[PDB]
Amino acid sequence: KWTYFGPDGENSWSKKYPSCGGLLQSPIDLHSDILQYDASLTPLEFQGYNLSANKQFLLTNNGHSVKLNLPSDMHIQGLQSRYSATQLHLHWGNPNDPHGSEHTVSGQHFAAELHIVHYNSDLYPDASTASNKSEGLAVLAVLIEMGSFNPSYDKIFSHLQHVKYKGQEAFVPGFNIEELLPERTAEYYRYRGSLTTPPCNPTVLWTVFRNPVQISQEQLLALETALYCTHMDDPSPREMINNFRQVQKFDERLVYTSFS
Amino acid sequence: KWTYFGPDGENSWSKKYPSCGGLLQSPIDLHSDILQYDASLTPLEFQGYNLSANKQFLLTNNGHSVKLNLPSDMHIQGLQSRYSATQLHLHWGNPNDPHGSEHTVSGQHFAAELHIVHYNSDLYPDASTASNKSEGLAVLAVLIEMGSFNPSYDKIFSHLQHVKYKGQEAFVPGFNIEELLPERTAEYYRYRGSLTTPPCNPTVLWTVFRNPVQISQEQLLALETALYCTHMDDPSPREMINNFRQVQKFDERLVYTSFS
């Protein structure tokens, strides 16, 4: 139905998912010509992010990324509405071009990107209901680069060998999800955009933190090499690589920054 | 029918032109991970580029860009087949984001981009016949950076105020098209790609010169502000800006370089 490579790739999403050719598409290149400092932008607070290690959270290969289900007890404070968490997931490149972030900064890719997806729990009863509705979603984006071994990201990566193929599932003990966030979360880019996957609904308030996190080259290579887009009974297996969208046109619109 | 913005923009081109969602699409980001030095990439020979000053060549605003007809007497020597010229045209951004090249270098746009389009006159009797066939097209790309005034590009730009609206035409007296090429044309990127506009045929052997040319801010501002996508008789004029395609995915494709 949709992929990031070949005839069902991103240039063809709009055939069956019209909003992929519509307004407010993400991701974008964050560059001086479209940035404006906004002193009204306050620091986000993260509530309920300390998940119990005695509780289990579902990790799934859905054929396009690895996703961790998150409880609606997790909230963002500091937006117009309360947003409650629904799931997180990643995007990455491939071992021969390990530059697979969705957002770029001054034209530069990072190695990977984390998305923590939330829904407007003040207006809507669940993420599905919010997904295609006004003010429906808020996503936190974390840029990832190569550096030191990251024990917090390994709380996810250590389970990759159990979700190699589409539909496979594994359980991840709770941990504090703030451990996936960078330093100085108070510095971020803010803009109105979309899901970066089908159905590409233009319903996302994006927060891209300025500062990346670091994972080891070994961790990045495990992520890049562990997973497949296909079912375990598929005679045509496809490696799950390059699962990021290209940057979108961003014309006569602004990205707001919390830093000058 | 196709545009660079809004509903008929580039994410929807594949609904209209099947090749725009197919393989080998251009333009691409030229970055280190995908570059491979190739000592077989010897200098092209530009033959008949010094156009007869007693001839005139048609400059047309076709609603998407400004194009100059070139004669088949112009050809590239040094490829397996001779390629004969058909036209040149430009791509640019807008005054608030004057970074409208199609190819990027290490994630960076240049101000604008010149394309000189050729067809395989050894294999095919004309450009329209060559365009959907094996090895049918060769395009030279010149990156354009903000810098010194360029008297050679002004041989084109001095006519922009006579092709302001869609369908309008002006004659350009023959001049030396080689004056539009950068320093050290022996230094280039080479790859297999496509038209960067509908119909997006995957039939183009691309040569992107390594070194940009310079035009002044004043020349760039004239290119970004002179032209409209609409007919003169349209009282709702639409500026011709940002007429470049976003870079495409490029995996299991390499770019070959004549420089290391």
Ligand SMILES: NS(=O)(=O)c1c(F)c(NC2CCCCCCC2)c(S(=O)(=O)CCCO)c(N2CCCCC2)c1F
């Ligand atoms: N990058 S992103 O932040 O835009 C973003 C999302 F937001 C949502 N899911 C959201 C959950 C809300 C409830 C219904 C679905 C809408 C979006 C999802 S999703 O899991 O729900 C799949 C939805 C349909 O493709 C994804 N994927 C795409 C497939 C790989 C896993 C992450 C995503 F990449």
Ligand SMILES: NS(=O)(=O)c1c(F)c(NC2CCCCCCC2)c(S(=O)(=O)CCCO)c(N2CCCCC2)c1F
């Ligand atoms: N960027 S590019 O170099 O790929 C490239 C081309 F190559 C060709 N022309 C090719 C050769 C001449 C006509 C035969 C069909 C193939 C197109 C053309 S074209 O004039 O022939 C139009 C083709 C239909 O849209 C264009 N345009 C797109 C619109 C504005 C003017 C330049 C182009 F941008």
Ligand SMILES: [Zn+2]
């Ligand atoms: Zn995502």
Ligand SMILES: [Zn+2]
């Ligand atoms: Zn072109």
